[PDB]
C-alpha cells in the first residue's frame, strides 16, 4: 500500500509536468550583473555568529553568537541598542518579534528563551523559558507576540502559547533532525527542511503535513518562502538550491554549478522574488536569477563561512553573518 | 549633524562595546574541552576531582588553569550538526572501554568519525583508554581472546604481565594508527591508559593541553 500510493504520487506530479520553468522563462530579459558592496560592517561580536533576524521596522536586527551574548543593532547608525547575556553560550537560532517587543533564542540547551525588550526598569529580562523539546532547537519564528513556532533536533516541530508556556500543537512527520523553518506571508501555514532530505508543508492550525517534497541528495540546511507564498526554496549540503512549488507539488528549478561543491548555509529571496540569495561554506554568497537559474553576482567579504543570511522587509538591504564574527550589510 | 539623543545613543553603544570586550577578556582565560564516549566508557568519571539536560558541564582547575568539559547528553548517533559548534575547543577528550572487545571496533569507527570531521580538522584528541583493570583481569583469566575479535593480535610482537602489555599496546596501536594515517600534523592524538579510579587525569589533560598550545605557538611564531 505504501509503495502503490507513492508511485501514484509520482504519476500525479509527473502528469502535471507539461513544461519546465526553464522553457517558460527562456524568453525574458536577464537581470544582468548585480553588484552590491558592504555599505556597513557591524562589529563587536568576539566569537562566531550563528543566527540573525531583521526587525519589521527594517532598521533593527538581532544577532546570536558563541560568545554567549545576543546583541541588537541599529543598522543605520551601527549602534548597539541592547546586549543580552545568555545562560548558554551554545545558540543556533534567534528571532525578532513582528511587533519588536520581544526576541527569542534557542540552542543546544533545548530551551527557547524569550526576552522582553521594552520594560519599565529599563533592562532586558526573560519573559519565558519554553521547555518540552528533547533535542536542540535549530530554528524559532514568531507568529504573534503570544505564539512562536520552533523546530528541533528531536525531529519534531511545535507551536507554543508563550503566556501558557505549553505546546498548543506538535508537528511530527520528519525522520531526521529539522534544520530550518519558514513561515508563510499569510502565516496560516509553514514549511520545514530536515536532515531526512525532505521538506514538509505544515498547516499550522490542524497540525498535519499537507505536502512533502523530496529532491535533495543530502540534508536541507536552509528554507525560505517565495514572497507570493506559493513557492519556497531550500538549501542543502548537496550544494544545490531547489525551488519548489506548493500547488504544482514538484520542483520547478535547481540552482547549481560545477565549481560549487560547498553546502548552502542560508537562503533568502529578494522582495520581488527575482533574486535568490544563498550563503555557502565557501565563505561567499552567490546571487541567483531565480527565474532563469543564472548566477547574477557574488558577495565576498567574509573571512569564514556565512552562517546566516537575511533580506530586509522593505527590500533595501541584505545582511549576512559569518564565523569571522563580523556581519555586514549589502545594498 | 548628530542630535543630542543620537550622541547619547553612541555613548550607550560605546559602553556596551566596553563591557563586551571585558567579557571576552574573561572568556580567553578559560580553556574549553569536549568529552565524547559512546557508552560503557565511564567518561563521566574520568576526572575524579570536580563534579541541564541539553548539555552537561564541569569545571576543574590544576596549576591555576581553569578547564571546561562539555558533554551533550540527549543526542542520537549522528552528531554532525551539533559537533559543528565545538570547533574552537582546545582539545577533545575521547573515552573508550578497552575491556570490552565487542565495543572496540565500534569505538574505533567512532574515533575515526571524530578524527575525520571537517570542522574538527584542527582539534587534537586526548584519548583515554579506560577500565584497564577490567582488561587486565580478563587477559589474566584468559577466557576471552582478542585474537578472536581481531586477527592481528593472534600474531603480534610485544614492544606487568607480558600478555597484558601486548594486548594493551595492540589496543592503543589501532587508535594511534587511525590517528597517524592522516599525517598532516595539524592535530595529534595523545593516548593514555586509565584505571576506573585514578587520582591524576586532570594532570594528564593539562599536560597534553600545554603540548597542544605549545605546538600552535610554534606554528604561529613560524619557528616550526
Amino acid at each position, epitope marked *: 500500500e505504501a509503495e502503490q500510493l507513492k508511485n501514484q504520487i509520482r504519476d500525479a506530479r509527473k502528469a502535471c509536468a507539461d513544461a519546465t520553468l526553464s522553457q517558460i522563462t527562456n524568453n525574458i530579459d536577464p537581470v544582468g550583473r548585480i553588484q552590491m558592496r558592504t555599505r556597513r560592517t557591524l562589529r563587536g561580536h568576539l566569537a562566531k555568529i550563528y543566527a540573525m533576524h531583521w526587525g519589521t521596522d527594517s532598521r533593527l536586527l538581532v544577532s546570536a553568537s558563541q560568545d554567549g551574548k545576543l546583541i541588537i543593532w541599529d543598522s543605520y547608525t551601527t549602534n548597539k*541598542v541592547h546586549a543580552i547575556p545568555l545562560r548558554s553560550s551554545w545558540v543556533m537560532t534567534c528571532a525578532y518579534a513582528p511587533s519588536g517587543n520581544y526576541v527569542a533564542c534557542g540552542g543546544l540547551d533545548n530551551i527557547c528563551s524569550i526576552y522582553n525588550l521594552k520594560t*519599565r526598569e529599563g533592562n532586558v529580562r526573560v519573559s519565558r523559558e519554553l521547555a518540552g523539546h528533547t533535542g536542540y532547537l535549530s530554528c524559532c519564528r514568531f507568529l504573534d507576540d503570544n505564539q512562536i513556532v520552533t523546530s528541533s533536533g528531536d525531529t519534531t516541530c511545535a507551536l507554543w502559547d508563550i503566556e501558557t508556556g505549553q505546546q498548543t500543537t506538535t508537528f511530527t512527520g520528519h525522520t531526521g533532525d529539522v534544520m530550518s523553518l519558514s513561515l508563510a506571508p499569510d502565516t496560516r501555514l509553514f514549511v520545514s527542511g530536515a536532515c531526512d532530505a525532505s521538506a514538509k508543508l505544515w498547516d499550522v492550525r490542524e497540525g498535519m503535513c499537507r505536502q512533502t517534497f523530496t529532491g535533495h541528495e543530502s540534508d536541507i540546511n536552509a528554507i525560505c518562502f517565495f514572497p507570493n507564498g506559493n513557492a519556497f526554496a531550500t538549501g542543502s549540503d548537496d550544494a544545490t538550491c531547489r525551488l519548489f512549488d506548493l500547488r504544482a507539488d514538484q520542483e520547478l528549478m535547481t540552482y547549481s554549478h560545477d565549481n560549487i561543491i560547498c553546502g548552502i548555509t542560508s537562503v533568502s529571496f529578494s522582495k520581488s522574488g527575482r533574486l535568490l540569495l544563498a550563503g555557502y561554506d565557501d565563505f561567499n554568497c552567490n546571487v541567483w536569477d531565480a527565474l532563469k537559474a543564472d548566477r547574477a553576482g557574488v558577495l565576498a567579504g567574509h573571512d569564514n563561512r556565512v552562517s546566516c543570511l537575511g533580506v530586509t522587509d522593505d527590500g533595501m538591504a541584505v545582511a549576512t553573518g559569518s564565523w569571522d564574527s563580523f556581519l555586514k550589510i549589502w545594498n | 549633524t548628530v542630535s543630542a539623543e543620537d*550622541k547619547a545613543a553612541a555613548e550607550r553603544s560605546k559602553m556596551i562595546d566596553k563591557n563586551l570586550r571585558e567579557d571576552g577578556e574573561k572568556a580567553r582565560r578559560t580553556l574549553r574541552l569536549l568529552l565524547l564516549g559512546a557508552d560503557n566508557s565511564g567518561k563521566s568519571t574520568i576526572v575524579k576531582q570536580m563534579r541541564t539536560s541539553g548539555i552537561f558541564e564541569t569545571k576543574f582547575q590544576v596549576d591555576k588553569v581553569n578547564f571546561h568539559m562539555f558533554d551533550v547528553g540527549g543526542q542520537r548517533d549522528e552528531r554532525r550538526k551539533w559537533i559543528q559548534c565545538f570547533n574552537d575547543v582546545t582539545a577533545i577528550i575521547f573515552v573508550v572501554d578497552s575491556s570490552d572487545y565487542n565495543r572496540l571496533q565500534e569505538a574505533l569507527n567512532d574515533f575515526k568519525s571524530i578524527w575525520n570531521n571537517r570542522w574538527l580538522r584542527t582539534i587534537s584528541v586526548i584519548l583515554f583508554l579506560n577500565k584497564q583493570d577490567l582488561l587486565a583481569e580478563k587477559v589474566l583469566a584468559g577466557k576471552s581472546k582478542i585474537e578472536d575479535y581481531f586477527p592481528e593480535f593472534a600474531r603480534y610482537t610485544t614492544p606487568e604481565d607480558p600478555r597484558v602489555t601486548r594486548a594493551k599496546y595492540f589496543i592503543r596501536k589501532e587508535f594511534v594508527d587511525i590517528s597517524t594515517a592522516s599525517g598532516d600534523g595539524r592535530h595529534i592524538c595523545y593516548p593514555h591508559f586509565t584505571c576506573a579510579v585514578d587520582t591524576e587525569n586532570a594532570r594528564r589533560i593539562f599536560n597534553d593541553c600545554k603540548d597542544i598550545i605549545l605546538q600552535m605557538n610554534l606554528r604561529e611564531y613560524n619557528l616550526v
Partner: single-chain antibody
Amino acid sequence: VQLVESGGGLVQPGGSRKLSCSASGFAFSSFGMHVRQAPEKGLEWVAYISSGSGTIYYADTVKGRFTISRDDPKNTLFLQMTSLRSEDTAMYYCVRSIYYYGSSPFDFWGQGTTLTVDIVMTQATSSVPVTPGESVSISCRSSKSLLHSNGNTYLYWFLQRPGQSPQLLIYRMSNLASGVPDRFSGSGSGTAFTLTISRLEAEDVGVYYCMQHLEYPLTFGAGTKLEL
C-alpha cells in the same frame, strides 16, 4: 519604579546646600539623569548626567555654581549647590532618561524637593476653557525647526496635574508614552506643533509643557493651563 528627592529647606543667600534623589526599582546605571519649577512659574532644566557619568551639561545660569554627580552603586543622584541666590528658589525634580533607538526620555519624574532662598519655545495660550467630553487643542512653536536630518522631530509634551510632578505624554511629536490613553495625539510640522486632546475628562486637566530635545540647553514653554 520610584525616585524620591531629599534635602531642602531655607538657605540664607550665598549659602550652599546639597539635594539628593534616591532611585528604586530601575537600573539606575543605564539611565541618564537630569529640572526645577519656580513657585508659580514654568519649568527650567538645570543639569544632565549621562550613563556612566561621562557627559555633563548645565544651563548657563547654574553653570560654574551648581555641580551634579551620581553614585551608581548607591543608586543616588546629587546636586551640589553653592552661593545660592533668590532666583534659585524652586521645586527641584529628579528625572530619568534612557537614550537608544525608540527610547522614551523624560518618562519618570520624582516628586521633588522645595528649595527657598537657545531654541525659544512659546505656548500662545495661558489658559483655555474646556467642557468635559469636548475636544481641546494645545499649540507650541519653536524659534528653530526641531526636525533633524535623521528624520526625528524632538518635541515632548508633559502634563503636570495639580499637586503632582510632570508626566510625559508624547515623545518626539507623534509617539505616545506608555500608560497614556489613546485620546492624546500629537500632530506637528517643523516650527509649528500641537497636541490634540479629544473626549476630555477629569484628571486630563493641568498645565501642559512643550520641550525641545534637539540641542542643549533644554527649554520648556510657559505652558497652557486647562480649566473646567
